[PDB]
RNA sequence: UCAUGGAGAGUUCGAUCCUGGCUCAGGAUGAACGCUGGCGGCAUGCUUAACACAUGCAAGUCGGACGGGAAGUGUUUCCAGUGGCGGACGGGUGAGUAACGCGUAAGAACCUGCCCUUGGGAGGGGAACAACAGCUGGAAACGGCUGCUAAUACCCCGUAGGCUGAGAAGCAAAAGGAGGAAUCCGCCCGAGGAGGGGCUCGCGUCUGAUUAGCUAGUUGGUGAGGUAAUAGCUUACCAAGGCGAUGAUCAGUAGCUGGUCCGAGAGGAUGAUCAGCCACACUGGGACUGAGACACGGCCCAGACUCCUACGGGAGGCAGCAGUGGGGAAUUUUCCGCAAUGGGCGAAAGCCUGACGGAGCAAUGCCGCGUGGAGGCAGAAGGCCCACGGGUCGUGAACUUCUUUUCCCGGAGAAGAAGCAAUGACGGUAUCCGGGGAAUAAGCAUCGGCUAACUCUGUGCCAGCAGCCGCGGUAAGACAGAGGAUGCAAGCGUUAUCCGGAAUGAUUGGGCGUAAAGCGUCUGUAGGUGGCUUUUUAAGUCCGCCGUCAAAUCCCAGGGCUCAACCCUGGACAG
């Protein structure tokens, strides 16, 4: 499927980043496009992500309870 | 049921039910009171188009709801298609071929299993015929000439353009579904259709 | 109520069709035990002596139910079968009592509309 | 494995049977990857869909008794 | 062309317009009660107490794995026991579970007996444990020493495209049986596949803020362990994280979904039978074996409860099918059969299946059919009403003929059953033929407006009716009766629950001067919306193609039951 690109929130954990993922969604009964945020824990053995950078989440083998993704880099076609 | 009942009541109330239950016109010695004086609610008018339809074919009213649901369910003029699903009813055809004088006469004439259709017997008056069918007597009916009595007294009115009566080999067939002009009874389709809008 | 945010919070919801019989609370009609068989009067425009049985039910409520028809057999501590339906004239009477059912006989000598009163055919 | 077997699909006293290749642990009226066949024992046809029966028998889903007997009426059996 | 869909009425007031609420007309029930009740076809049949349960049955099988013994007199049938699979499927219920449990859609870290394909192997030894014989304990349930025995049962050595490890090195298996043979069923080690499972994740998944903080194996990291496999799965230490005003945590409710019902539509309510997934099996908690359970009819323990006891102890789990008792308004027979279908075992023969196939009762529902057809002087008998002339019951009946769906009395008589024959609970059922005979068969609501149907007698604010308005104090089209009429029809009504109507929670579709409603006004955070031109990516958007959304249902078209209901075959828009 797709990746889930999104900003890094706070990386005060080794090999671990929280990521806000912003997702538009049609609200069911009323027809707008409401955003919903959902933040994840991603893995990086390199841990080369500061606060505020934005990554892409890809499914991998689960590392902990929450850490079920590792994020590498977006493509960046502007 | 059948309603099996007093029937000049229904002819005086609904107007003359054509062919069904009489060729004799109503009130040969009657009607000498009961001024209507012109007050009739519109619901009474639409109700009298229900029962002008329901007694003329002898249907159960629940079965008439069934035919309206099929008539909506088909594509086209539901005011006409209701009078296609109630013309190609079998005992209406045996009435219309003159195989019986009245429609209870045809319904009873098909209850006691006197009609073969395409060589197979049909025991049920609510059978809906098709184009290009075959409607005959029973093999005993060349010895039981009740049908020939009905065909004897019948032929004042001829036939509508679906029927083809063969004189001695007693076979009647319908070329195609009956046209609205073809329908014998005179009534407004819209009045009946509007009435069932409520359900 | 804009389409944006006063209404993808919520509009509001209507409550229910509010129950027009707080007892009978499973389903339609329920066995009863007679406690009082007294008689009360309607509101001001009418004038009658309407004869109601205050009845304990098998549900867990106690409720004053009307007794239809003309004659009534209902003494103290008999068993009835109440049903819903609001008698307007009486404040508090919410229910009826079925006639012709268990330990509440049919009405005396009625020949018009017997299925509402539990009287078998004559003739 | 999968066991190609009939299932009753009809009214009372009717016995219109489908030939379905479901897993053998299922109840007799369950769900299939592909419902391949038909068998009407009163009097009618029997659509068979030969390539799919050869797919499953090529895989190795053995049939039951009378499914195998229907497969012995026609010349379905080729070992390729 | 598309369109197959949208109805109003009553009630505030002396009247009028309006807001607004209530009530009705329409469908649907797993329904209940009342009155009435001919048949047939197909469905449905504890919604409540996941409440106890009498009795029988619901899971076996294999002697072609093995040893014994017990009927029959070389020959066969059985059998408790050790083994082999099956008891994890099928059946039942929805208590819990607001959660990857479910639905849908992806993924990698796994397992997998029976099932197909495929590469190789089965030498050698050995010890017992049941059974059994003896003694003996117990009322039973069960045992306990003493010896003995066999194997596809156990153990050891060698050998292995496997495993461990960086390599070095090591480590690991087998079973025979049937047959004269032929061969077949097996066994052990690998390698795939199908199917079945175990996990993980995106999204969807009820209300309540008069519940605002929660969480310390908690959220991460490493090391050690552990699991079939990843993992705080577990443990020691380190880091302080993680969730939340877009509702965390708590409380309450609820099995979920294909679907059902309604609605014109958007969608609202709901999850019976049919089908898929989950959970439970008296209430709790454990583990064992196997491929697979923390196992409904397995084991062990605790708790409560019932039965037996000879008083020491035992035995038990109907939310399996029938059934009893209780609760309830209310939900059936302690039935027949493995003939089919589907399971399990077996080489086969066959065996066992309360799954399933049928039958019985119940108008519980949907559909079909009958209670007569045609004529009937217009003359009589009668009820009710009448300006006493008559009218109306009424072609209705009486009466004459025709017919026999059904009814009775007889005959015949299926397929369903599968190419070796035989093999049917249903059942002499379905269906057909013959002989009488209109014979055996119509009720229930309503008649003041909505709402079709109305006059008369009795009652006199009484008895009563009533869905809302309201009728009822002497001539009541509203109560009670009769006549008549109306609508329905083997049904008719009332009640309850749900949707409609209701634009009365409003996206389609409402309002806020005075009718219910603008915060007292202002600053501003989060958040929402946003000027113009040019360029770029395409997240939204649109188009093509592809995958999937099980089957059943709904829609179209065919086909089958004498039609319909129902069943079946094929197809597909939506989304």
From Swiss-Prot, chain A:
Superkingdom as given in the UniProt entry: Eukaryota
Subunit structure: Component of the chloroplast small ribosomal subunit (SSU). Mature 70S chloroplast ribosomes of higher plants consist of a small (30S) and a large (50S) subunit. The 30S small subunit contains 1 molecule of ribosomal RNA (16S rRNA) and 24 different proteins. The 50S large subunit contains 3 rRNA molecules (23S, 5S and 4.5S rRNA) and 33 different proteins.
Protein name: Small ribosomal subunit protein uS17c
Subcellular location: Plastid, Chloroplast
Family: Belongs to the universal ribosomal protein uS17 family.
Task performed by this protein: Component of the chloroplast ribosome (chloro-ribosome), a dedicated translation machinery responsible for the synthesis of chloroplast genome-encoded proteins, including proteins of the transcription and translation machinery and components of the photosynthetic apparatus.
From Swiss-Prot, chain B:
Main location: plastid
Single GO BP term: ribosomal small subunit biogenesis
Subcellular location as annotated: Plastid, Chloroplast
Entry annotated with the keyword RNA-binding: yes
UniProt xrefs under CDD domains: S4
Any one Gene Ontology cellular component term annotated for this protein: small ribosomal subunit
Region (Disordered): 14-42
GO MF, one example: structural constituent of ribosome
Keyword Secreted: no
Residue stretches making up the S4 RNA-binding domain: 88-148
Any single Pfam family the record assigns to this protein: Ribosomal_S4
UniProtKB keywords: Chloroplast, Plastid, Ribonucleoprotein, Ribosomal protein, RNA-binding, rRNA-binding
PROSITE patterns: RIBOSOMAL_S4, S4
Subunit comment: Component of the chloroplast small ribosomal subunit (SSU). Mature 70S chloroplast ribosomes of higher plants consist of a small (30S) and a large (50S) subunit. The 30S small subunit contains 1 molecule of ribosomal RNA (16S rRNA) and 24 different proteins. The 50S large subunit contains 3 rRNA molecules (23S, 5S and 4.5S rRNA) and 33 different proteins.
Family under the similarity heading: Belongs to the universal ribosomal protein uS4 family.
Function: Component of the chloroplast ribosome (chloro-ribosome), a dedicated translation machinery responsible for the synthesis of chloroplast genome-encoded proteins, including proteins of the transcription and translation machinery and components of the photosynthetic apparatus.
Annotated protein name in UniProt: Small ribosomal subunit protein uS4c
Organism this protein belongs to: Spinacia oleracea (Spinach)
UniProtKB/Swiss-Prot annotation, chain C:
Gene symbol of the encoding locus: rps12-A
GO molecular function annotation: rRNA binding; structural constituent of ribosome
Domain of life of the organism encoding this protein: Eukaryota
Species this chain originates from: Spinacia oleracea
Assembly description: Component of the chloroplast small ribosomal subunit (SSU). Mature 70S chloroplast ribosomes of higher plants consist of a small (30S) and a large (50S) subunit. The 30S small subunit contains 1 molecule of ribosomal RNA (16S rRNA) and 24 different proteins. The 50S large subunit contains 3 rRNA molecules (23S, 5S and 4.5S rRNA) and 33 different proteins.
Keywords for this protein: Chloroplast, Plastid, Ribonucleoprotein, Ribosomal protein, RNA-binding, rRNA-binding
InterPro entries, A to Z: NA-bd_OB-fold (IPR012340), Ribosomal_uS12 (IPR006032), Ribosomal_uS12_bac (IPR005679)
Keyword rRNA-binding in annotation: yes
Disulfide bonds: none
GO cellular component: chloroplast; ribosome; small ribosomal subunit
Name of the protein this chain belongs to: Small ribosomal subunit protein uS12cz/uS12cy
Curated annotation (Swiss-Prot), chain D:
Primary location recorded for the protein, binned into one broad class: plastid
Subcellular location: Plastid, Chloroplast
Keywords: Chloroplast, Plastid, Ribonucleoprotein, Ribosomal protein
GO BP, one annotated term: mitochondrial translation
A molecular function (GO) term: structural constituent of ribosome
Superkingdom to which the source organism belongs: Eukaryota
Record PANTHER family: 30S RIBOSOMAL PROTEIN S16, SMALL RIBOSOMAL SUBUNIT PROTEIN BS16M
Function description: Component of the chloroplast ribosome (chloro-ribosome), a dedicated translation machinery responsible for the synthesis of chloroplast genome-encoded proteins, including proteins of the transcription and translation machinery and components of the photosynthetic apparatus.
Description of how the protein assembles with itself and partners: Component of the chloroplast small ribosomal subunit (SSU). Mature 70S chloroplast ribosomes of higher plants consist of a small (30S) and a large (50S) subunit. The 30S small subunit contains 1 molecule of ribosomal RNA (16S rRNA) and 24 different proteins. The 50S large subunit contains 3 rRNA molecules (23S, 5S and 4.5S rRNA) and 33 different proteins.
Name of the featured protein: Small ribosomal subunit protein bS16c
Organism name: Spinacia oleracea
Gene name for this UniProt entry: rps16
């Amino acid at each position: 499927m797709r990746s889930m690109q999104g900003k890094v929130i706070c990386a005060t954990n080794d090999k671990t980043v929280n990521v806000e993922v912003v997702r538009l969604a049609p609200h069911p009964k009323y027809k707008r496009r409401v955003r919903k945020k959902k933040k994840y824990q991603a893995h990086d053995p390199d841990n080369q992500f500061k606060v505020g950078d934005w990554v892409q989440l890809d499914k991998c083998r689960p590392i902990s309870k929450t850490k079920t993704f590792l994020a590498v880099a977006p493509e960046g076609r502007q | 049921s059948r309603y099996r009942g007093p029937r000049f009541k229904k002819i005086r109330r609904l107007g003359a039910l054509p062919g069904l239950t009489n060729k004799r016109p109503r009130a040969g010695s009657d009607l000498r009171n009961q001024s209507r004086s012109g007050k009739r609610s519109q619901y009474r008018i639409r109700l009298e188009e229900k029962q002008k339809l329901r007694f003329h074919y002898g249907i159960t009213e629940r079965q008439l709801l069934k035919y309206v649901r099929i008539a909506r369910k088909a594509k086209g003029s539901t005011g006409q298609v209701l009078l296609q699903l109630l013309e190609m009813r079998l005992d209406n055809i045996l009435f219309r071929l003159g195989m019986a004088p009245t429609i209870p006469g045809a319904r009873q004439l098909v209850n006691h299993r006197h009609i073969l259709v395409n060589g197979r017997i049909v025991d049920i008056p609510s059978y809906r015929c098709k184009p290009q069918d075959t409607i005959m007597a029973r093999d005993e009916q060349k010895s039981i000439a009740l049908i020939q009595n009905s065909l004897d007294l019948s032929p004042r009115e001829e036939l509508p353009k679906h029927l083809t009566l063969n004189p001695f080999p007693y076979k009647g067939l319908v070329n195609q579904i009956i046209d609205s002009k073809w329908v014998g009874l005179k009534i407004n389709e819209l009045l009946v259709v509007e009435y069932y809008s409520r359900q | 109520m804009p389409t944006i945010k006063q209404l993808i919070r919520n509009t509001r919801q209507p409550i229910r069709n509010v129950t027009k019989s707080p007892a009978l609370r499973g389903c339609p009609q329920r066995r009863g035990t007679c406690t009082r068989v007294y008689t009360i009067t309607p509101k001001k425009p009418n004038s009658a002596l309407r004869k109601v049985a205050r009845v304990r039910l098998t549900s867990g409520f106690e409720i004053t139910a009307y007794i239809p028809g003309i004659g009534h057999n209902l003494q103290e501590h008999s068993v009835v079968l109440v049903r819903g339906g609001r008698v307007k004239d009486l404040p508090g009477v919410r229910y009826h009592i079925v006639r012709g059912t268990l330990d509440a006989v049919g009405v005396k000598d009625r020949q018009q509309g017997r299925s509402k009163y539990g009287v078998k055919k004559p003739k | 494995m999968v066991k190609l077997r009939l299932k009753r699909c009809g009214r009372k006293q009717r016995a219109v049977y489908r030939i379905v290749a479901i897993d053998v642990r299922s109840r007799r009226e369950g769900r299939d990857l592909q419902k391949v066949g038909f068998y009407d024992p009163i009097k009618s046809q029997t659509y068979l869909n030969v390539p799919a029966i050869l797919d499953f028998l090529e895989k190795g889903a053995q049939p039951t008794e009378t499914v195998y007997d229907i497969l012995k009426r026609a010349e379905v059996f080729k070992e390729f």
